[model samples]
Target: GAAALKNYYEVHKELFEGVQKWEETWRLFLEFERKASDPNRFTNLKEEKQRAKLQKMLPKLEEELKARIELWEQEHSKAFMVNGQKFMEYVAEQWEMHRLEKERAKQERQLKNKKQTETEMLYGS
Candidate 1:
């Protein structure tokens, strides 16, 4: 199942544009691709090591991806979609758009409030 999503995962993931240090992220990407050759399930002893490695690190990478995705959406106003066999892919993708829109609306409201406050102060308040 994990292997099924591996290819789509790489394409959707945004690379580190600022830093060129491939060692930090590329290693895991390579490891994921390398595991496609093995035909054992997670329960199989032959695949235990690879599964453990991914199980241990995939979550952290996902967390970081979430944070970066949020920031990217907020700053640049773009939505990200990571399509996979899991149904959660749609939910996650929609959530990203919803969150971005919410952040933008909040910012607009704050700016309006600040402008109103300044205007009132200048007039009489």
Candidate 2:
């Protein structure tokens, strides 16, 4: 199932790439907002100009993101006919599931290694 989800991601790589770019821009904008809110940091005129620039750009980027998602949803519904939650919800759910599976596998590997070390110690090697 994870592999299938991964394949789906690959098939829609462009959408995800745009989404990731938006997220990065949003994160930077938020950081700037936080700095702007602080009296000491807000004193920097250069940063204030940059903040204003980002503030203006954010909405345009957001509109583009929405349009991309809506288009993706339309195409997916037409082809797969799978209807339920938004595309992002499904992606988030699958991503979380994949992360948990990887964590579990890592723990299992560590346990196996611990057992191997114990065996070596008992044999004085």
Best by lDDT: 2
- The list of candidate 1 runs beyond 4 A from truth reads 1-46, 83-125
Q: Which ten contiguous residues of candidate 1 have the minimum total lDDT? A: 15-24
RMSD in angstroms between candidate 1 and the native structure over all alpha carbons: 20.3
Q: Which residue pairs collide in model 2, if any?
A: none
Instruction: Report the backbone clash tally of model 2.
Output: 0
lDDT of 2 by residue, 18-122 (tens): 666766665676677657555465455588788888768756765765576777667566432224645455445654665686677678889999999999899
> In candidate 2, where is summed lDDT lowest over 10 consecutive residues?
78-87
Against the true structure, whose TM-score is highest?
2
Q: What is the lDDT of residue 1 in candidate 1?
A: 68
* lDDT on C-alpha atoms for all candidate structures: 0.52, 0.64
